[PDB]
Amino acid sequence: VDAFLGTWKLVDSKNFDDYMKSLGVGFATRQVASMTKPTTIIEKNGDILTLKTHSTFKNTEISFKLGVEFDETTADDRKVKSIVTLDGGKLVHLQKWDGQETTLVRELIDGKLILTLTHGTAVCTRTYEKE
Ligand SMILES: CCCCCCCC/C=C\CCCCCCCC(=O)O
Numbered sequence: 617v618d619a620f621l622g623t624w625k626l627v628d629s630k631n632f633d634d635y636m637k638s639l640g641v642g643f644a645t646r647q648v649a650s651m652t653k654p655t656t657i658i659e660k661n662g663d664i665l666t667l668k669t670h671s672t673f674k675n676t677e678i679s680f681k682l683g684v685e686f687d688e689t690t691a692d693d694r695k696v697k698s699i700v701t702l703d704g705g706k707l708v709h710l711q712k713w714d715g716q717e718t719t720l721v722r723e724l725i726d727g728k729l730i731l732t733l734t735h736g737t738a739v740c741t742r743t744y745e746k747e
Pocket residue numbers: 636641645649652654656669670671673674675676690691692731742
């Protein structure tokens with residue numbers, strides 16, 4: 617997982633409104649989210665990964681072991697059961713709640729971190745660059 621480690625800043629986003637709307641996020645939160653450029657920090661300490669997402673709007677932090685389920689409260693206030701694994705060199709984060717699922721997939725492509733978010737028919741792509 618070592619190539620994912622570091623500090624990353626958002627530089628491009630496509631279809632995030634569609635993804636938020638699919639999750640039921642209200643229009644006022646979508647407004648602010650469309651103008652926010654988060655910083656994501658990924659760190660490791662032995663087998664424990666910590667993923668921080670910082671912005672002027674909301675901040676989140678989770679710590680987990682790969683392949684072990686954990687409880688997570690998301691930035692939009694869903695209480696989900698999560699698991700993160702490495703699949704084909706990608707970091708795959710699966711969230712389940714109320715019979716629903718969403719995936720947050722991170723892959724490294726030409727030095728950039730590409731985050732693909734899928735829920736329902738909505739697919740959002742967010743591109744991060746390393747700081
Ligand atoms: C912590 C800041 C995340 C981005 C601004 C706040 C958005 C909150 C609205 C819906 C959350 C949807 C699920 C999390 C999206 C994370 C996107 C990302 O890491 O770039």
